[PDB]
């Protein structure tokens, strides 16, 4: 199957800074068959990006995905407080449709 | 190409250098160029400055020459001693030139050389020549007529195919 | 307004059979079909299977082949997820998501897992 | 072509807005028309597969190498222009050949799917029907609406109507 | 340094008249002993590269 | 291939100079051979379509960028030579792949047309004939020259010879 | 596709290690399975033809035009980089399209060969058998092992079992 | 020597039916087929239809579909143009032209409208 | 359908000068399916060019056609008195086979 | 160890029929098939024909079509070359060579005439 | 058919020198379908090269073949005494599979 | 002294005349040499009248 491995496991950055999340596939996947998701503790995962770079409806333009082949990237241009969550990448080019293990994003300052 | 007289009148020098290399009647030169010398068989070449504006809708091909004598003795005989400088100015263009007396192998029986430099004067733009000798001035400027293709060949032209 | 509303949470004994529903509103049915994803507590998401509401064709992952059965509306545009021989591993949150254009050719992945259900916790234990 | 979508089947059904392929039966109960979902979806999948493979862009970044404002020197300019034009020709060739080749296969595979469904029904009826020649099957045991539906979802038992049909030739 | 085979600094004494189907340059290479450089050095390297020696 | 032009039909007819496809019948009146104009023309159209698409030239003009008489400087010369060779490789690849691919399709579509005409006749005879296995149809009602001609121009009424033929199996 | 390798024939035989295609018969003497050598070899030839055409290298020699040690001047460097990247894109496009196109044809021609062998047997049995619908032929004259072998090597005389078979319908 | 000779000029009442002929000499028949072009007085040329003398296949323009019928030699290698329900608009000069290679594959458009007839005026009026 | 629009409507030039006639298609037509015709008042149109650049039999070499895609050109290199006529371009790539509205060429000098 | 061992030398009268054998050891049979090459005294090599031991398909050169017949093992993995109507021209050395992979797809020409036999002289004369 | 013509007819070179043998086809043959053979007086021809450049098993690395299209070359980098023989090129792309007429290699020094 | 290459730029001033140049810098030939590891060049002024910009 296709293995999606995300990095880093955990990303901690102050609010208003730029976050870069990686998803690296084992096999070459076409850009159309890749999606990014956000999930907070307890709720259903909301779709952020589809097709590797297309923003989903009502998604803020600070979430932008890029990349091709085996390397895909979700960029949070300027972090907001409500961006603290877990982020999963997904492939559905060939079944089984697989997910990345995720990347947690945390903020800062006491 | 379509030429155009640039209109260059002089004073205090000669203007009709020639050579057996360029044969027409007897010794001649470049039709579009002028070999500027000094008056007598020595003496100085007064630092001159000549201008030309391109008053036409398209860019003007400007060409000039620097003459490298066989020796420093021949150069003094022609233009006079001391360093000889040629500066050339325009809007896009900005350069300068220095002569280089020395012995070269004989081509067409001669050991002197001439560097031919060129710039493309823009419409309404003006070029200016500062020079004190060793200068081969343009008599006329050139203009491009339209569009063509150029080939290099060793076979005959056939107008029927 | 497209919305996926799943059934209530469930508690089952090991070796039993569970049945989660997914009610459809907003779109038309048989124009997409449904993907199912499950999430173990404290773990990530894993795809379970997909069924077309247009053709009825199902595609499962190897892990669930033989004890999972996906079906779709009797006529009321609703999809079902039937798991049986429930291990304690099957303890997870079961999400249904509207997925993949059907009776029509369309470029891109706009209709791929575009709307999800709120979820359905399935606790498989004896206590 | 293949095995005739625009051949023995003389024309398509503009009234068939339920799918890409389907059946149109006639019996003692009236007129009937229904789409086939699986064969339609087969075709739709393949075309969608093409499109998503074709619609795509590079992740290769190309920069400026000449100048629109202050022109580069002629010799390097002419090399650059010559090279760029050459790549243009190659991509122009590739593009038009690609589209032409894909369109040939798209049409032919749609032909293929229609032929596959057709000859499937043919094997489904065994000796209980005969080939009309226009894509139809003349049935020799007066099939009712339930009988027709059994043919549509590939469940029709040929040997339960065999006696009556073979008698009527 | 490949250009050194022309001028002949000490490192290139064994190469002043070399022959090869395959010529290999190394990063430690140096065209020069007395500090200096070649005008149009890359043009000359490409000539010597396809020279055979 | 497709459905066998060089398969169950063992060989072609060198005597068939009237068209690309045709019929050769045998009865009580002698030997007969006639071409099929429409299926031949179908094939001819498609191949003509290819050729006219393939035979073509650019309207893109390319100029001189190096010099056969007084050689350009080495560094720009080597870049130019390297680029030109690269384009040559691409066009050499494109050309040989193009021709190879086209030839594969030309042969296969000719196969297609032969199969289409063949299975058309098969549906045209209904149950009045049986498949020989070599592209022939053994007729069970001794078809005369007018009967054969009705088969050629697709007018043969199967149900006017059906009784006699089904009797003779 | 074509005419269904992964269609009416539901699956392949992992036990068939003797060839790529074959027969599996059932009678009063037990179970039998044997490969077909000629149709297998037809497929093998075509694929081998592709591979040997595809696996190939240039005899064109390309040289160095920039420098890994002492970098060339920026302007000529950027032209070179721009050109090389462009060729890379073209070859990347060509490569992926080539492989994709070839794989489509490989699968389809294997389909073709299976269909060709299948419908060959169909014509080989004439009216002595009937189409099962799953790639099988229900025989109506209880064929023994020698009878089966005659079907395998294309020698089966249909008219020597015709009477018995047509009686049993 | 290839030549196309058409019938004489004609005068018809509105709503009637006209029939222009085109005699063929020079080439072989059924090796090309014929295109028909008509030209209204003071106006340009407009294509009417094409018929193969080899296959018999015809292709008309939408304007004339249903009231134009093209046919070819009884055996004497001659093509006919049959128009009916003649409007006053149908007043034009009707040209036949030899067109498009048939029972043979050939590159290029050398046999496309290569030879024309002298013409045939068709006046559709009641007076 | 494919619309062939010619320009100019009328071209008036002295004898021995160079005439350039344009035919612009709405859709991309292959060069092979394009022809030029000459017509004088009363007679049948004679074919000048076929395939966009091929001269027809016994046609003077002062009639040369060029162009590709959507822009096609008939050039009369040096006009003669008998060149005064109307010139039509034609497309027969896809049916309906359409004609341009024409260009009239007239000469000069009283 | 793959080895091709042919039969002994032979002397035949003109118009007769000769039969050269080729015993196979080392490989498996019907995995390659055999090419036959013949060499006239003082002359070069010329290809005669090829037979598959897997399919039985034969391919001859035009010169020998109709009087050459290639066959393969009764069951003992051995190939035969049957020539008849022997001319005096047929005087040559007849080599068999293992040639071309059969029941398997393989890239390259590694199995093309890779192992030859020692040869077999065939003298066709009356004296 | 495909004609393989070899050159030269006879090559005579001292031992340890480099021998170059040409085989020129009439038609373009793919490199895979070309073989070189060595033959000595009386014995069977042993295969040296297959596929135009691949060395056969246990063949010394002084036999190297190259070339493509219509021009193919067998190079004996350094001749040994036992290299004195006749060398044939073969094509088996399309039947009839044809051979070159051969090249004889002879050595030197009395 | 930094981890990346430094863009260095300088200027040569060509006076309107030789009189202006002496007024500015003084008579005699004026030379500007520039040296580095990779770089090695020199520059000469050129007094003369140009069009006014
Ligand atoms: C050139 O100069 C003339 C004279 O002032 C002016 O009228 C004209 O607009 C100028 N054109 C350009 C292109 O500078
Ligand atoms: C190269 O083509 C461009 C247009 O794409 C043109 O503006 C430029 O002048 C051309 N290069 C040269 C050296 O003329
Ligand atoms: C480039 O190739 C040509 C032949 O096509 C050759 O004459 C020329 O010398 C080559 N360029 C250089 C710099 O050698
Ligand atoms: C061109 O790309 C190479 C890597 O392939 C890079 O090292 C080099 O710096 C690039 N050229 C320039 C001028 O930067």
mmCIF file of C-alpha atoms and ligand atoms in Angstrom, chain D residues 66 71-74 77-78 81 84, ligand 2:
data_model
loop_
_atom_site.group_PDB
_atom_site.id
_atom_site.type_symbol
_atom_site.label_atom_id
_atom_site.label_comp_id
_atom_site.label_asym_id
_atom_site.label_seq_id
_atom_site.Cartn_x
_atom_site.Cartn_y
_atom_site.Cartn_z
ATOM 1 C CA UNK D 66 15.929 37.582 -21.492
ATOM 2 C CA UNK D 71 17.159 43.832 -24.623
ATOM 3 C CA UNK D 72 19.951 41.312 -24.107
ATOM 4 C CA UNK D 73 22.843 41.027 -26.557
ATOM 5 C CA UNK D 74 21.830 39.709 -29.995
ATOM 6 C CA UNK D 77 19.190 36.581 -27.588
ATOM 7 C CA UNK D 78 18.942 34.614 -30.828
ATOM 8 C CA UNK D 81 14.686 32.653 -28.996
ATOM 9 C CA UNK D 84 12.280 28.604 -26.762
HETATM 10 C C1 LIG M 2 12.850 37.122 -29.618
HETATM 11 O O1 LIG M 2 11.432 37.091 -29.716
HETATM 12 C C2 LIG M 2 10.809 38.177 -29.018
HETATM 13 C C3 LIG M 2 9.322 37.916 -29.046
HETATM 14 O O2 LIG M 2 9.008 36.688 -28.401
HETATM 15 C C4 LIG M 2 11.213 39.494 -29.671
HETATM 16 O O3 LIG M 2 10.627 40.580 -28.961
HETATM 17 C C5 LIG M 2 12.733 39.631 -29.669
HETATM 18 O O4 LIG M 2 13.115 40.789 -30.400
HETATM 19 C C6 LIG M 2 13.384 38.390 -30.285
HETATM 20 N N1 LIG M 2 14.835 38.457 -30.161
HETATM 21 C C7 LIG M 2 15.608 39.225 -30.931
HETATM 22 C C8 LIG M 2 17.083 39.153 -30.660
HETATM 23 O O5 LIG M 2 15.143 39.952 -31.805
#
